[PDB]
Each structure stands twice: as structure tokens, then as C-alpha cells.
Coordinates of C-alpha atoms in Angstrom, one line a residue:
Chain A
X943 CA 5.0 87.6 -4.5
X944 CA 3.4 87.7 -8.1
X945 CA 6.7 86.1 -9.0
X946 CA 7.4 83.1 -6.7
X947 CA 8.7 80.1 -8.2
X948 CA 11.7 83.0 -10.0
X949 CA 12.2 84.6 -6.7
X950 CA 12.3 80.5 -4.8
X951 CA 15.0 79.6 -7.1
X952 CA 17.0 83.1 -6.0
X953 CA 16.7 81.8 -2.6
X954 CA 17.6 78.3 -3.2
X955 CA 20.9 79.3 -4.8
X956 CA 21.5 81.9 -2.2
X957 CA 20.5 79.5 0.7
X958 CA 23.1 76.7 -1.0
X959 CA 25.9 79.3 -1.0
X960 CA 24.9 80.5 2.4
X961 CA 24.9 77.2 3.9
X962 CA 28.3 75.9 2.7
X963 CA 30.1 78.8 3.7
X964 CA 28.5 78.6 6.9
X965 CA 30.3 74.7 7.2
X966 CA 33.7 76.3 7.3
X967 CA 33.0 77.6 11.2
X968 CA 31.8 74.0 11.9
X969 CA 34.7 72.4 14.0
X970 CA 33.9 68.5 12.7
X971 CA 35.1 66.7 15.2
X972 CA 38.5 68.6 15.2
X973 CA 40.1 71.0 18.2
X974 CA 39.1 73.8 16.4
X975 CA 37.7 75.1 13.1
X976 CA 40.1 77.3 12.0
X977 CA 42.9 75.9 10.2
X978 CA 45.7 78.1 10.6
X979 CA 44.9 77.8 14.4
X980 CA 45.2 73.9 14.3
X981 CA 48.5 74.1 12.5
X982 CA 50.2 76.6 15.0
X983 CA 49.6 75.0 18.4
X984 CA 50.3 71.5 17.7
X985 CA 53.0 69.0 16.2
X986 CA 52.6 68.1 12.5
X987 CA 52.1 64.2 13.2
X988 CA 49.6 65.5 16.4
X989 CA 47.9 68.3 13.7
X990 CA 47.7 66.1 10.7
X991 CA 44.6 64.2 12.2
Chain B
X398 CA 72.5 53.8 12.7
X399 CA 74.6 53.1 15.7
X400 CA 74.4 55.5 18.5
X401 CA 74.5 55.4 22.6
X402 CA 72.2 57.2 24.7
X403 CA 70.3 57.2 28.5
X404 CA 67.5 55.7 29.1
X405 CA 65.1 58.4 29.1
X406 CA 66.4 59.0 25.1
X407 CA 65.4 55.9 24.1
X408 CA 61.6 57.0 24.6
X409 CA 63.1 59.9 23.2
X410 CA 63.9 58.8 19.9
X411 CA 60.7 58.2 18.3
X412 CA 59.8 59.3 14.6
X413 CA 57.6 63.1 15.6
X414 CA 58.8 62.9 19.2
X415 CA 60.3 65.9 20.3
X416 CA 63.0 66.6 23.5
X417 CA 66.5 67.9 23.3
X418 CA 67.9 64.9 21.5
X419 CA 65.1 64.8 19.3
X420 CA 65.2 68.5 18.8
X421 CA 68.8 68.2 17.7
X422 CA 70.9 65.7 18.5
X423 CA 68.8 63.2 16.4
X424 CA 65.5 63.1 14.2
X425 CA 63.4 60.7 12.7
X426 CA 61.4 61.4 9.6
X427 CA 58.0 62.0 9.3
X428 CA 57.5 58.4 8.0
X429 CA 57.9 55.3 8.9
X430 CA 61.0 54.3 10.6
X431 CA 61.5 50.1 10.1
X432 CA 62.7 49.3 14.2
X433 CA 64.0 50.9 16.9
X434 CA 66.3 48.6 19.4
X435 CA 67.5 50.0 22.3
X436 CA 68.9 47.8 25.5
X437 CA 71.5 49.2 28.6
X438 CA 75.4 48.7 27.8
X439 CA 76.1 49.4 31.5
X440 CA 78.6 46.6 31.5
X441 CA 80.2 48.2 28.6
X442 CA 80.9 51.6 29.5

């Protein structure tokens, strides 16, 4: 760890990639995360909220 | 538009309802439709 503030900002930028990908499973509120789910089993009026 | 239909119909036309007349007999856009006014022409028939 001669190197930390190089190797911090490697992890930074990894952890900021990691994180927002990670957002995608998140369901938000909706009946399920996964879009192509949400569209099949319900109406468009029902699925477009 | 001019149609007549049962009672049950009426409900069923609706804009993103769905039943057998909505499925096919009749659809409403996925928009707003101005007014919908439905009332019993027993006498009639």
C-alpha cells in the first residue's frame, strides 16, 4: 500500500461503476425490477406506471 | 360514434379496458377519449 491515494481512485471509479449497475436489480417502488417482466404480465396503461 | 350495447358494455367500453367488446367489437385509444354517455333504450327496442 506504498501507492494509496493511485490505488483509492482505482477503487473509487470501480466502486461508482459497481454501484450503479448494482441499481438496475433495485425494484423502486415498481412490481418488479426487470423490465421485460413488467411489460409482459400487465396492460400497457396498467405497465406504464 | 353511435352504437347500442348491454349494460355490462358500458363499463366495458373504457379507453385500456379490455373484455370481448373491447377486445374486438370496439376500442378506445390509448389517449384521452372526450365523454362517454351511455343510458338504457329499453323502451326503444
Amino acid at each position: 500500500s506504498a501507492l494509496g491515494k493511485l490505488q483509492d481512485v482505482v477503487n473509487q471509479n470501480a466502486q461508482a461503476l459497481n454501484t450503479l449497475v448494482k441499481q438496475l436489480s433495485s425494484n423502486f417502488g415498481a412490481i418488479s425490477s426487470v423490465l421485460n417482466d413488467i411489460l409482459s404480465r400487465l396492460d400497457p396503461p396498467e405497465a406504464e406506471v | 360514434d353511435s352504437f347500442v350495447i348491454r349494460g355490462d358494455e358500458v363499463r366495458q367500453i373504457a379507453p385500456g379496458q379490455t373484455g370481448k367488446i373491447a377486445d374486438y367489437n370496439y376500442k378506445l385509444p390509448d389517449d384521452f377519449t372526450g365523454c362517454v354517455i351511455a343510458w338504457n333504450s329499453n323502451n326503444l327496442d
